[PDB]
Design a protein around this ligand. Structure first.
Ligand SMILES: [Mg+2]
Ligand code: NA
Length: 165
């Protein structure tokens, strides 16, 4: 029973960079984050990751355990944001905008340590949404630890934070 639960939108790139080495795109972090929400009963989970991350590990952009991305895609959970090469240069659509817009329109939660304040300054309704619906986190090795107080001490509990009740 997970439609008393708010839909969950995970910043795949943020979580990947947060987990393990802070200089490595660690896809296990994405799996661990998703698994944490799955074990609680969530059924509406979307992970946004730029499409160019499917490319093999380059020295500029290191990445581990790539197979998880496609696996999560086949499981309907992960969605790739558009990206392509024009005239020898990589063009990337702002995945952060996908994250914010989807979560806002689905009336859900954003899982990220990124504040997205450029987008917040762009649209007032987005700023208010982010202020009230951003779930930050911390990684202790393979342990995914979100705070019981997402909005501080006067905010709701983590349990009630994820419910539409
Ligand atoms: Mg980002
Ligand atoms: Na990382």
């Amino acid at each position: 029973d997970g439609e008393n639960l708010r839909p969950v939108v995970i910043d795949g790139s943020n979580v990947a960079m947060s987990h393990g080495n802070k200089e490595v795109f660690s896809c296990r972090g994405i799996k661990l984050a998703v698994d944490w929400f799955l074990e609680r009963g969530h059924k509406d989970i979307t992970v946004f990751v730029p499409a160019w991350r499917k490319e093999q590990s380059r020295p500029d952009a290191l990445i581990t355990d790539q197979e998880i991305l496609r696996k999560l895609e086949k499981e309907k959970i992960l969605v790739f944001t558009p990206s392509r090469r024009v005239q020898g240069r990589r063009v990337v659509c702002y995945d952060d905008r996908f994250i914010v817009k989807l979560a806002f329109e689905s009336d859900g939660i954003i899982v990220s340590n990124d504040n997205y304040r450029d987008l917040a300054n762009e649209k007032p309704e987005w700023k208010k949404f982010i202020d009230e619906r951003l779930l930050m986190y911390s990684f202790v090795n393979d342990k995914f630890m979100p705070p019981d107080d997402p909005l501080g001490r006067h905010g709701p509990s983590l349990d009630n934070f994820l419910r539409k009740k």
